[PDB]
Amino acid sequence: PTVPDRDNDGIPDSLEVEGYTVDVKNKRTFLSPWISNIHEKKGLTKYKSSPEKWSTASDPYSDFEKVTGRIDKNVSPEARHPLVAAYPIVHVDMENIILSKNRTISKNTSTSRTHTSGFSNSNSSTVAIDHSLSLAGERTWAETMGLNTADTARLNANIRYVNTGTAPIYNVLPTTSLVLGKNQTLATIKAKENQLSQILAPNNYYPSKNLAPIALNAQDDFSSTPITMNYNQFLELEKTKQLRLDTDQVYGNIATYNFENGRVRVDTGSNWSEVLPQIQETTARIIFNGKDLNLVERRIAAVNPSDPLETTKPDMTLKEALKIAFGFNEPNGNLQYQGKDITEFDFNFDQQTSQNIKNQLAELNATNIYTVLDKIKLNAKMNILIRDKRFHYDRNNIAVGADESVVKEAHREVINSSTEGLLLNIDKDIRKILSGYIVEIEDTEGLKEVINDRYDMLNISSLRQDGKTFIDFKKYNDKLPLYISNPNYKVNVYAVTKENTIINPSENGDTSTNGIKKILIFSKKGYEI
Amino acid sequence: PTVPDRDNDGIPDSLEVEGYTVDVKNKRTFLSPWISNIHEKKGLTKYKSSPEKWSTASDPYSDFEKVTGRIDKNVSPEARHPLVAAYPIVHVDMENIILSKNRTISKNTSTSRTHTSGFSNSNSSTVAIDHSLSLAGERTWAETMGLNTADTARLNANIRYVNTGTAPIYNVLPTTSLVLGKNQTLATIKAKENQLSQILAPNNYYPSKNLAPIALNAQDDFSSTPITMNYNQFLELEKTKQLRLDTDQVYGNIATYNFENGRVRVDTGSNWSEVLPQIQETTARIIFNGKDLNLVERRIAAVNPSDPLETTKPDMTLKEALKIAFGFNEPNGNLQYQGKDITEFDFNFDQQTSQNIKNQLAELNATNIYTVLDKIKLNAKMNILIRDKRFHYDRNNIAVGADESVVKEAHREVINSSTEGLLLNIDKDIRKILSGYIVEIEDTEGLKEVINDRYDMLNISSLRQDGKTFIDFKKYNDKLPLYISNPNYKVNVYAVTKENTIINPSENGDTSTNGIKKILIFSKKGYEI
Amino acid sequence: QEEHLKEIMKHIVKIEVKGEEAVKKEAAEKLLEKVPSDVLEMYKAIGGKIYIVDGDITKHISLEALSEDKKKIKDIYGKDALLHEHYVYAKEGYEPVLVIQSSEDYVENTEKALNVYYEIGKILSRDILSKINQPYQKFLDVLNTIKNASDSDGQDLLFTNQLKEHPTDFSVEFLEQNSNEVQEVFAKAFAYYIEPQHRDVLQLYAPEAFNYMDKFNEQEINLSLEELKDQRMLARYEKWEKIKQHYQ
Amino acid sequence: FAKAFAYYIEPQHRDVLQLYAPEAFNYMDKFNEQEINLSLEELKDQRMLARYEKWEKIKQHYQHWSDSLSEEGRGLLKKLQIPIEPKKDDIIHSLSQEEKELLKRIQIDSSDFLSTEEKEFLKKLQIDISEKEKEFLKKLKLDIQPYDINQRLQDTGGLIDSPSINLDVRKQYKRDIQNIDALLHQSIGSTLYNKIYLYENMNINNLTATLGADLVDSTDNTKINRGIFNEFKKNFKYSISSNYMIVDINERPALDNERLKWRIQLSPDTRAGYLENGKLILQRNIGLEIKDVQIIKQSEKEYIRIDAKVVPKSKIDTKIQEAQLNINQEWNKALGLPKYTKLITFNVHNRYASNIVESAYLILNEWKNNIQSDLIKKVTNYLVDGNGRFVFTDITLPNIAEQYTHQDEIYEQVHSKGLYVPESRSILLHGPSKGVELRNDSEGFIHEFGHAVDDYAGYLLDKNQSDLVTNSKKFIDIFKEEGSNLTSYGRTNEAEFFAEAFRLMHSTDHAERLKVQKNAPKTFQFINDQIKFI
């Protein structure tokens, strides 16, 4: 009669500890104990959970609610599993800025969510402004804008918020402060009031790509020019051309599911700023840049030996974590992510986490973690960073370069070549670590004539509407076709990786591509062209 | 007997899954299990639903209320069926504007709710300003309004709100921002406070057609000219004559039915801005322009394989969806909408949906979807667009033109012809893709004299109060009847559809209709008049 | 809130479908149940029995060949109706027969149930009790109390026009010379008493009439059956059998 | 089996079982909570020591009753156990008149009424020693029956006053049973024992000779034909025993003709007697409800296992009246009869009761759909115009009520598959017996129906005269020519011939209809002419 359920979460004790699964019988859904033979053919996942936790992940959705689907239909699919915390992760993306003096520099920007190292739970992004010259004659920003020693420039940018987490935010929108250099806070972006009545579902923008982005300067009367900026500051900006956007975790309320009638109402009692601390202190954190070289962070519930209540959670071995959080599978029993074997990735651990794993590796007598992967225990609070092993990385764990040899194979497929340009087809991921191309012409006797011989004249590679990259020569040429002094002269094309780029004129203001680390990328004679 | 009912929605479990129907017995209404032979002759619809959802559609009215009628009597009929989500869809319709400088150009406008392509869940419309010259002498707006390089024009428009959805909005009325060009946001029309105390039932206007429309400019002291606009903006406007009206989804509260006394009271806890997200992630979206070439949007509840609870919804086949959502029927077993067979319509799908349907077409070994229609399963989140195959369309899926053959066929019924004009009776739908007519006279030896020989002098076709089209020659003539140099001279008339129209004078300001592709529409000799 | 759903829910959600024709049989049987059983035994004992037809009552073998002239009938309210449209007729003769047209709406509504009970009362007073002349002074005494009473619309409810014009109190001679009018008044009273929703109306406007009928249906109907049986020789003879056997 | 068993006992998995294997759950549900105790005893029932212990534990309880038995009680009981054979010397000495010489030279082997065993009795008398002699033979039959108390009880159904036999014999029978009734004064009820099961082997031919003819597989007598079995189990739900049950104590191997193995549970209130020979005598008029019907295997031979629980007969009796009301109310609307008529009243007091009641819901369905609607109504109207009612029984026809009274002669008794009484206008259908000719039960009805219909047709021609369609010179002759062109049974006489012809012309197999058309063309137009009268 008891069918005991101490945690009072719908699922009985025995089911939670041993394994269960929900499976639809024609139109009625019921919860059943895991049978090995009848469920595997049906493609059902074997769940486990804690008999003493109303929500094993510790986030606001019960063990029962997640797997049954009675839940805010916006929680991302992979987070339906009881061991993956569902919470929001908001960072700010700046699309473009404009400058003037209290002859207007209007440039488009590109941002990437960052993470650096003892790395802590606080969101930040990093914009890097493009250096290429949209206008030929706009050499030296200091003069295109009449900035004087005793002048002040105004900054006016466009931003959108991106939610890369696993749950929706409802009312509030986070406060976020702009910072130049190490600690020079230029401005704190106000928390607009009673204005974010829309929703940020995971992997969405606010406002969507179809609407005007929120103008940063109010354009109202709040402050005439909130973003003033002294001369010396402008200089700092010119040498680094980078800014930082720090955002806090003050989100809104929480959307809960009501059992009596199935209505999802935003309750004003439960607030994410009370939950995040629980999640962040009882889970192991896994950061992965596999999908599109962007940092996707997921959290898995692991046991913490020191705490009675915590020994109840199912032991979680690393191997399963990758399987349920990101999509790894076993075609032939070898862990891989969409073809790419697990061995092409690095494992980096915080100093704390490192020590713990070294112990675990000793009682098993193994040296290569890639073998004993399914035997590694996760404890609470480890932080793990899995990055593609083939690319070079900077201090902020952003993809920045790669070994030249890898770069070459990506170009070994010349779909067509003429005197007007190439329409290549490159793997979408590589063309985000290439700043530009050096074009040069070679005399029949070994001379070398480089066409776009200026640091800020590299942006010659566009992308066609069918995803085929097209390189235009006439852009930084003289609007003239490509000339060849000899049908026997070889035509060489070079690519320049980010790490090896120059961002300002040199010591003696050199603009030549001399001291630039250049990789050989193409070499066809006149006859081939 | 304790008939089982987990979803707690009045109808017992077994009934919902297999099929039921409500039928009024003389004066008492009772719910009955579907009997195949005794109910079909009575023209009753076979309902099905989800045994585990208090509202299969997920909108705020329970499975029981929709079919029984205990519901806000304003919900549109087509939404009474349990599988059609009932929610509001508000867009803004602007009837006419006026311009001046901080001698007022007052032109009437026509607006159509738009939808373009990767199309997202946000309503927007598009106004088009009439280009025809109301005044003879008003050539070149730049001069009719004293606009100088350092001037600013003031904008004062009249707008009305249109509800084309299926449910009422109650207290609030949405904020919406006007934008010219690609990203130039001119103004955001304030959300007047505590003033929309009336109701917007589906297919109604606010304020109604019998009252003055809400003036856009406040006419008060809030801003002297809220719609400021530098000179350069005015130039784009002169070249494009297009404005966009983007509106968000912040509607009011929801009206619920109370069992205790049958009172419909507006509950201040539940708000549409919390429900719409649920609907938009669990339904298939069908857009149809069949009735009057206007975009009607409906949402149907479809299953989602990945989610246990969601497999509970009754399987919905495409053929039945069209039947219950719009009014299609089977006089002879052939799907048709008022005469027009289903075959006269296109099916267009988003890339996801396209891919999904290609699979569906493979396990059945068929190539023409028009046949296997009753075998296509709908899953959640597909988007389908059904447009008339005979008309040409623009990028924003607006009706813009047609094949000449259709244009000629639409005119083969000459009710009357004289020297003062034509009185036709054409199908109401065609005259929404015809911009105007070119009248010309032909000498017995092949000469050609065009009466209204100016680009901006085409709006000569009025409509009489009995729906008979009447073309007036004296309008853009010299207020004189039509002269004919020979009772044997043929009179040729050409029609110009919008897509083939010119909107501004050419390079050298040509006003002749020369380089315009014109379709011949009439040709009777001088004596055949 | 959760409470109310159940009551509405039960009334509307018919769990199973009885059938197309079963409902018909079940409706008629429930109706006749409410009449005290002892009345049915008296009817059977005096001969003919009620048979339920399904179609147009106007055309049935038992009734087609007899009383064609009497096409004019008066409902309980006194308004005239043609027989074909009407749904229940009865006939008094050598073979007392009562015919009721089957329908599915006898439980739900009441105006139709009232006429059936009305016809049972007319058969009872004219065909059963008349064999013993049971309506007599006690019925006449209550009757007399209704005519002379303070503005009692009760008269309007049970008396026809013919009665409203007899100036003095009712006399034992009148009932003998005219016995259709009095028997009718009995029938109406019988009908109103059986139908639950009308019970209150009766007791309200004719208290004494209600009192009379209350004691009559309570403990004065078994006496009707026994006295009726006292005319049948075989009933007397079966009685002799039982008494002699036991104490023998 | 084990897998299914496991899932049901474990509480948490029971629901899983019910969802994916409904049928498996149902089987196991009834298995583990009533049938398992029934299974335990049979295992112990194999050990001779346990059987002996059970028999001994029963003795002492009945020791006092046995020790107090008188000589008259034991002597009476002895007669019940052994069938009593009639003595020839007694009957011969009881005649003494002219009839025996007349009887001396009679064509014995020409009476259909006599049966084989009775012919042998006559042949033994004959060794010692189309007219009026077969009527004298009818009387002798009512005198040569063996004195068998138990046999009398089912034929009369417990109604001991039946005037079906000689008064002196009647007095003799009544005294012996009433004396036996007093003997069974001790109830089984005790504090010494719980549920006790006893067994009895019975021949299927005793319950239904129609099913018994094809129950056993035609080729291998050790297997049972599943097709006929399914019909037999369908409506076997309850039974009543009016006579004296002779039961065993320990199961013993059965004889060839016993294919039913009954398992009867008793109630502490049931009155019963103990026998020293390992048998028990149960009180008469006991009711039994059938809980299950299944096929079992034993010693390489198939059998039918039937369990049963004793309950008060009144509880079963209530089922029969409620069944009576359901069938009569349904057909009054379909026919057009007055609401309150007692038409299909049936009284049954035997072992196969439940099938008889349900079989009514089948004979009439086939009866209506096969005969012209106007004939049924007209004839039913005729039948109601009198006091006749249909009567379905499981006792021999001479014992119901109506038959004996009106015939009035003692020797006028007749028993057979069906019978029609013109005087009382009633149709009698004895379910238990099997027509030596008829193929099923429906045909038995139609034959009796023919006799009744023929009476009304004759009635309509003239009201004052009571006569049949035959005896009119326009039909007697017709029987002399075509009368022998069909079955030999109809050749017997005109009355059976009309009835015989009537079923065939309305048989469900059109072939049979064609046969009667091409073999007796004259009769075919004649029959269509009497039925026209409507």
Numbering used by the authors:
A (entry chain B), B (entry chain C): 173 to 274, 287 to 301, 323 to 734
C (entry chain I): 32 to 279
D (entry chain H): 217 to 345, 369 to 773
What does the paper say about this structure?
Like other AB-type toxins, it is composed of a surface binding/translocation moiety, the protective antigen (PA, 83 kDa), and two cytotoxic subunits, lethal factor (LF, 90 kDa) and edema factor (EF, 93 kDa). After cleavage by furin-like proteases, the truncated 63 kDa-sized PA monomer oligomerizes either into homo-heptamers (PA7) or homo-octamers (PA8). While PA8 can bind up to four factors, only three of them can simultaneously bind to PA7. Both enzymatic substrates bind to the upper rim of the PA oligomer via their N-terminal domains in a competitive manner.
We determined three structures of the fully-loaded heptameric anthrax lethal toxin complex, which differ in the position and conformations of the bound LFs. Binding of LF to a single PA protomer is mediated via the N-terminal domain of LF, orienting its bulky C-terminal domain such that the adjacent PA protomer is not accessible for binding. In this way a single lethal factor de facto occupies two of the seven binding sites of PA7. In the chain of LFs, the C-terminal domain of the anterior LF binds to the N-terminal domain of the following one, creating a directionality in the complex. This results in the two complexes PA7LF2+1A and PA7LF2+1B, that differ in the binding position of the third LF. In two of our structures, PA7LF2+1A and PA7LF2+1B, two LFs only interact at one position which is located next to the major LF-PA interface. In the other LFs (1LF, 3LF), this region is flexible and not interacting with the α-clamp.
